[PDB]
Amino acid sequence: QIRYSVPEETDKGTVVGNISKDLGLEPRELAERGVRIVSRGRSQLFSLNPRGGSLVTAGRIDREELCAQSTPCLVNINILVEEKGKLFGVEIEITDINDNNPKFHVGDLEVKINEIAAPGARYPLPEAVDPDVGINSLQSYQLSPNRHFSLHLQTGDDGTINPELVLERTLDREEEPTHHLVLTASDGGEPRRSSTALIQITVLDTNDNAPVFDQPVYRVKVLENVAPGTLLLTVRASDPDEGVNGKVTYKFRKINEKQSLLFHLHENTGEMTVAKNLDYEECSLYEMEIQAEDVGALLGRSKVIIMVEDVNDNRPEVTITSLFNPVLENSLPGTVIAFLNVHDQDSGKNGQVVCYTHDNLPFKLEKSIDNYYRLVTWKYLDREKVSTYNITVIASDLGAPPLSTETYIALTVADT
Ligand SMILES: *[C@@H]1O[C@H](CO[C@@H]2O[C@@H](C)[C@@H](O)[C@@H](O)[C@@H]2O)[C@@H](O[C@@H]2O[C@H](CO)[C@@H](O[C@@H]3O[C@H](CO)[C@@H](O)[C@H](O)[C@@H]3O)[C@H](O)[C@H]2NC(C)=O)[C@H](O)[C@H]1NC(C)=O
Ligand SMILES: *[C@@H]1O[C@H](CO)[C@@H](O[C@@H]2O[C@H](CO)[C@@H](O)[C@H](O)[C@H]2NC(C)=O)[C@H](O)[C@H]1NC(C)=O
Ligand SMILES: *[C@H]1O[C@H](CO)[C@@H](O)[C@H](O)[C@@H]1O
Ligand SMILES: *[C@H]1O[C@H](CO)[C@@H](O)[C@H](O)[C@@H]1O
Numbered sequence: 234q235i236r237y238s239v240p241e242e243t244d245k246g247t248v249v250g251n252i253s254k255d256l257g258l259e260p261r262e263l264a265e266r267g268v269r270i271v272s273r274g275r276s277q278l279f280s281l282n283p284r285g286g287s288l289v290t291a292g293r294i295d296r297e298e299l300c301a302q303s304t305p306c307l308v309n310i311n312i313l314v315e316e317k318g319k320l321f322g323v324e325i326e327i328t329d330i331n332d333n334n335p336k337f338h339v340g341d342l343e344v345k346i347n348e349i350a351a352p353g354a355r356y357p358l359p360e361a362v363d364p365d366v367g368i369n370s371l372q373s374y375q376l377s378p379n380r381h382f383s384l385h386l387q388t389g390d391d392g393t394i395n396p397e398l399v400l401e402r403t404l405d406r407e408e409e410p411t412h413h414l415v416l417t418a419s420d421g422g423e424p425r426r427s428s429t430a431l432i433q434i435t436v437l438d439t440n441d442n443a444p445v446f447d448q449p450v451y452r453v454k455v456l457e458n459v460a461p462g463t464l465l466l467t468v469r470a471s472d473p474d475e476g477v478n479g480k481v482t483y484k485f486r487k488i489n490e491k492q493s494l495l496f497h498l499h500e501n502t503g504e505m506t507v508a509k510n511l512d513y514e515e516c517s518l519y520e521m522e523i524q525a526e527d528v529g530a531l532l533g534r535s536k537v538i539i540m541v542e543d544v545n546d547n548r549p550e551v552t553i554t555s556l557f558n559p560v561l562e563n564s565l566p567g568t569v570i571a572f573l574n575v576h577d578q579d580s581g582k583n584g585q586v587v588c589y590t591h592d593n594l595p596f597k598l599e600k601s602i603d604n605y606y607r608l609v610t611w612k613y614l615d616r617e618k619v620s621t622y623n624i625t626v627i628a629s630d631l632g633a634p635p636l637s638t639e640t641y642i643a644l645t646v647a648d649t
């Protein structure tokens with residue numbers, strides 16, 4: 234029936250209550266009558282101060298350990314006055330003080346959310362506990378800011394609270410594979426204590442990105458006399474998908490195209506090289522289509538264009554299409570004696586032909602229609618001074634290194 238109050242975690246020997254006044258006696262009388270305390274468990278932590286004539290604490294008083302989460306912390310002791318033969322009941326309340334932070338059971342948690350996870354899905358979060366009760370228990374859950382997540386305080390009927398992370402915006406690990414959040418838990422008493430909990434969010438990969446070539450069309454020029462195996466090109470295709478979902482193989486699209494037989498595209502490195510010799514005079518252009526795939530068979534498509542260059546390799550060929558061999562000695566300057574056809578299978582300046590004959594001879598070569606030539610006469614001839622002629626005609630293309638074919642025209646001069 235003697236109520237008192239005391240703060241916990243207080244020093245030893247702190248005043249609990251003026252017992253001698255509420256007993257109607259002096260301190261020396263308390264030390265004289267032999268008034269003691271009845272031997273019970275909790276009463277071990279209290280003691281009687283005669284000089285102070287009061288009630289002092291003789292041990293550590295932790296409410297969090299003593300009464301746990303009960304709403305009032307009460308300790309009842311019985312005081313026995315022997316000479317008066319009377320007994321008194323003392324009820325002592327212990328107040329709560331915020332010396333315990335909200336302690337998370339787990340310091341960190343990994344939440345594996347898929348890349349293709351739809352918004353609205355919620356995942357459980359680590360809970361906190363505060364041995365401090367009342368307003369000194371947990372009161373505020375503060376989640377670190379993030380554009381993709383929110384904090385929901387779902388309350389099961391039994392559980393007082395249950396924090397959970399809510400996915401409100403879609404994710405893509407191709408931009409960020411892992412997130413890091415700070416889950417602060419604070420109790421609403423002064424001084425304000427708190428404790429955090431780091432939450433890593435691992436975004437698992439989904440093969441949602443297909444291989445994409447750097448350029449849609451690849452153009453490359455090449456000489457026709459390149460040795461087989463020469464590195465013509467090296468194609469690159471990017472796949473941001475993780476690991477095995479990013480390993481890309483390149484291959485030709487067509488099924489055993491002749492161009493695919495002529496060339497080799499390496500599967501792993503994508504290096505396009507020559508396999509067999511290729512002549513400009515057969516095909517000057519090669520249009521092929523290549524593709525790149527990850528393991529998910531996601532298709533990227535591109536087109537490689539190969540242009541050949543006509544380096545000189547074919548010499549001209551002279552075809553004497555006409556020859557008026559019995560030449561008249563009295564022929565006027567300007568009469569034709571032989572028509573020639575010249576043809577260089579090469580192209581450009583490598584296919585342009587020029588013809589040459591000796592200077593001392595009275596016969597010149599003149600150009601004509603459709604790369605023809607005519608062997609014209611411009612000076613009169615002494616029949617005996619020149620009876621037989623073995624003319625050397627040299628056809629040569631204008632592409633270095635020049636190629637030359639020589640044809641010999643046999644003729645004889647006759648008179649009348
Ligand atoms: C007009 O002249 C050409 C060649 O031009 C002249 O003769 C050469 C020998 C050189 O001195 C040149 O600088 C010169 O301007 C005559 O062509 C020649 O034809 C003969 C046979 O028709 C070739 O003989 C060859 O001999 C070898 C080895 O014996 C054989 O394997 C061959 O099968 C072939 O028989 C000779 O090589 C060839 N000249 C050249 C340079 O190739 C051409 O006959 C002549 N015209 C007339 C009407 O006489
Ligand atoms: C318990 O309470 C009594 C009464 O309130 C206290 O007695 C007072 O002591 C002070 C000491 O300076 C005096 O000035 C007052 O005149 C006293 N009042 C009365 C009514 O006696 C006493 O000191 C307190 N403590 C103990 C151990 O008895
Ligand atoms: C948790 O938050 C409180 C503020 O409410 C801080 O004072 C404390 O140090 C902890 O960071
Ligand atoms: C929240 O963050 C702090 C660092 O500021 C940690 O020390 C704590 O354990 C919790 O993870």
Ligand SMILES: [Ca+2]
Binds near residue numbers: 294297330332
């Ligand atoms: Ca305490």
Ligand SMILES: [Ca+2]
Binds near residue numbers: 329331333365
């Ligand atoms: Ca406390």
Ligand SMILES: [Ca+2]
Binds near residue numbers: 332335364
């Ligand atoms: Ca607390």
Ligand SMILES: [Ca+2]
Binds near residue numbers: 405406
């Ligand atoms: Ca993606």
Ligand SMILES: [Ca+2]
Binds near residue numbers: 438442475
């Ligand atoms: Ca992905």
Ligand SMILES: [Ca+2]
Binds near residue numbers: 440441472475479527
């Ligand atoms: Ca991929």
Ligand SMILES: [Ca+2]
Binds near residue numbers: 457547
């Ligand atoms: Ca050629």
Ligand SMILES: [Ca+2]
Binds near residue numbers: 513543547579580
């Ligand atoms: Ca050529």
Ligand SMILES: [Ca+2]
Binds near residue numbers: 580584
């Ligand atoms: Ca040529």
